[PDB]
Design a protein around this ligand. Structure first.
Ligand SMILES: Nc1ncnc2c1ncn2[C@@H]1O[C@H](CO)[C@@H](OP(=O)(O)O)[C@H]1O
Ligand SMILES: Nc1ncnc2c1ncn2[C@@H]1O[C@H](CO)[C@@H](OP(=O)(O)O)[C@H]1O
Ligand SMILES: [Mg+2]
Ligand SMILES: [Mg+2]
Lengths: 247, 247
């Protein structure tokens, strides 16, 4: 149904306005990257280890909001085939503060590795071209751990550690950018993970804001991503906590 | 039109799900307050001055998401008269990390002052009752600078400084919580203010995320808050930046 597709995407409009237009979103990005620099500078690693920073790309270092905008304007729910075309369009922007932090790490005895679920086989060329144009240093192919078979990221973090690096901090907009412990889990377990790690945020886990999509969307209901459009609309509306209007 | 009221509030649903349900939102709250503690501990003030922290309430220290949820469920655009009833309902929650940071400041040679546009005359009693119940220390009436005549906050910051305090940091979800320089201005000027203060975020300006409302909403278009419901919907949709779908 086209009506359902329209309602689903209309539900993203206000958060998209916030991410695209507000100074507040920019301030949060700068806040995150300012905190990240402090954590990096403070970090000490084991003897023999090299300092690594792990960074997610989409909505962490790369700004894909125009794809979301296209979804809104065309009543288009997410489709990986449309996403691939977006990547190939080479119109990605940079999240504020990301290039500076990236380049600072790489010039101060660290290395940023990009652990990202952009696809290695079909989305790598556009990703690298955009990042070069955007001013990121260190974007040789060896810095990238793009998605091959698995969306969960922990195995790639381990690959990095096997190369002689100690990861001093992680940057992301999705809790699954910090490990696998709540990958595919509902929001109750994900909030619990955050509580169990309260002191790490702004130190070793650096958060960027993303009100448009993510593991929290799937976390709204068991089997959310398997539901049809109407089912997803209902899951979102059912998750809403509302005042009863009484005193 | 009821159809317009419904569309306007439907546009807030996804960002509301994110704020209410996601671990990511909690992580951002903890990140902000972890950073705030570091800044407070580092702060030095002029001889003779007492250390003050200025904090906004709504969506900074107090969580009002159930009011937004009620708006969604009842197709109700914002109305200060409904808001007053919400305050009186005494169902406010605390933003994660806020009580701990508040109480830490107040027990470590500082004072948090609440500079908030909850209304002094009609909304003070519910505000204080909720904050007491939520566990905030230092919520005597003298800590509060609630709205009387003016929504712009700088004059109240000055009142605090005249009492012998030096403000060491500001906490908020709205750029207008940091001063008056972009109060009532459009988002271009507000983003410019953020850029001009890039290094302060996460240090002396502490940001909390709010994808549901704020000065950025009014900032979407000249005279936004004066427009009717259809006009506001059009302003939001017109602000959207969209990929053209081409390569
Ligand atoms: N609406 C959306 N739904 C799922 N993924 C999206 C998305 N918008 C952007 N993405 C990105 O596509 C990859 C696979 O999930 C992820 O890459 P990252 O690991 O973040 O670099 C998404 O964020
Ligand atoms: N949807 C909304 N629109 C305007 N204000 C809202 C709002 N939801 C909550 N508020 C709050 O009402 C006061 C006046 O603007 C502000 O208080 P604070 O200065 O943030 O404590 C709003 O955030
Ligand atoms: Mg991401
Ligand atoms: Mg506020």
């Amino acid at each position: 149904e086209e009506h359902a597709n329209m309602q689903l995407q209309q539900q993203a409009v206000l958060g998209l306005n916030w991410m695209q237009d507000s100074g507040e979103y920019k301030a949060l990005a700068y806040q995150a990257y300012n905190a990240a620099k402090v954590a990096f500078d403070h970090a000490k690693v084991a003897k023999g280890k090299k300092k690594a920073v792990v960074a997610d790309l989409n909505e962490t270092m790369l700004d894909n909001s125009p794809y979301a905008g296209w979804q809104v304007q065309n009543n288009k729910p997410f489709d990986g085939k449309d996403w691939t075309r977006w990547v190939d369009a080479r119109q990605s922007r940079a999240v504020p503060g990301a290039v500076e932090f990236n380049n600072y790490v790489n010039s101060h005895n660290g290395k940023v590795f990009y652990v990202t679920n952009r696809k290695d086989s079909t989305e790598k060329s556009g990703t690298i071209d955009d990042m070069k144009r955007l001013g990121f240093n260190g974007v040789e192919e060896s810095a990238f751990y793009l998605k091959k078979d698995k969306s969960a990221k922990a195995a790639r973090f381990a690959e990095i550690e096997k190369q002689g690096y100690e990861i001093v901090l992680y940057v992301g907009d999705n809790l699954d950018d910090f490990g696998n412990t709540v990958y595919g889990k509902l929001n109750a377990d994900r909030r619990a993970f955050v509580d169990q790690n309260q002191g790490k945020f702004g130190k070793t886990f650096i958060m960027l804001p993303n009100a448009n999509y993510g593991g929290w969307e799937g976390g709204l209901a068991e089997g959310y991503f398997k539901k049809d459009t109407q089912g997803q609309i209902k899951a979102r509306l059912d998750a809403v906590q509302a005042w009863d209007g009484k005193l």
